[PDB]
Amino acid sequence: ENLYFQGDLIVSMRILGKKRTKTWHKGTLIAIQTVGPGKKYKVKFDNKGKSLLSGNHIAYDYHPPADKLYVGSRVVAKYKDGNQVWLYAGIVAETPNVKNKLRFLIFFDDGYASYVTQSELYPICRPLKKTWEDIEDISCRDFIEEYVTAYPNRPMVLLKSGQLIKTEWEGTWWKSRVEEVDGSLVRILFLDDKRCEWIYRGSTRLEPMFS
Numbered sequence: 240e241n242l243y244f245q246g247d248l249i250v251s252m253r254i255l256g257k258k259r260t261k262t263w264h265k266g267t268l269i270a271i272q273t274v275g276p277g278k279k280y281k282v283k284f285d286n287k288g289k290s291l292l293s294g295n296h297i298a299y300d301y302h303p304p305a306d307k308l309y310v311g312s313r314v315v316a317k318y319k320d321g322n323q324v325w326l327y328a329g330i331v332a333e334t335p336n337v338k339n340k341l342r343f344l345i346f347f348d349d350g351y352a353s354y355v356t357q358s359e360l361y362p363i364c365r366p367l368k369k370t371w372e373d374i375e376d377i378s379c380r381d382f383i384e385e386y387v388t389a390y391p392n393r394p395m396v397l398l399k400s401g402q403l404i405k406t407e408w409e410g411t412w413w414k415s416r417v418e419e420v421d422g423s424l425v426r427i428l429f430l431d432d433k434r435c436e437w438i439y440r441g442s443t444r445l446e447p448m449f450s
């Protein structure tokens with residue numbers, strides 16, 4: 240059947256939709272379709288191109304109130320990529336507290352982690368019951384499932400600036416150095432390449448965690 244209303248969604252609403260590039264873009268909800276127990280949402284992107292999407296592949300164009308966000312919430316967030324920014328899907332790993340200077344920690348679907356503000360988040364409209372089950376990469380999906388279900392039990396390595404450690408990249412161990420710590424994240428310098436990455440302190444990419 241063709242619907243005009245479904246839960247709090249209404250045909251003609253402005254929304255965000257997931258493109259095949261896996262980045263998220265503004266559009267209009269132009270149709271809602273049922274096939275028995277299934278629902279699909281037809282979106283016209285601001286370029287006139289159209290997709291028929293599942294409810295976990297659309298998000299509201301508004302910032303969620305803090306009482307609606309939990310560890311494990313499915314969100315779209317601002318993803319900082321060199322000098323350019325995209326909207327990309329992730330999972331809430333931490334809500335604001337004194338130790339994180341009142342920020343949200345996001346674990347993005349590609350395995351990147353970053354702190355963001357409430358004004359950098361958008362809630363997915365129809366998340367799955369197990370919110371991690373639409374993460375395409377198997378190793379990223381299994382990590383989130385264990386993290387979210389074990390919380391608040393979170394093994395982490397205590398690190399200090401200047402500490403020499405081994406860090407994983409492309410399946411092997413690299414000589415690296417701790418440059419800075421920010422809450423649950425550490426900035427690692429790869430010593431041969433002379434470039435940095437922000438990594439979660441509970442990641443088995445850090446040899447001390449792995450051991």
Ligand SMILES: CC(=O)c1ccc(N)cc1O
Pocket residue numbers: 345346347348349350351352374378379380382383438439441442
């Ligand atoms: C270790 C880590 O930071 C991490 C793991 C899985 C994932 N989907 C996203 C992530 O950010």
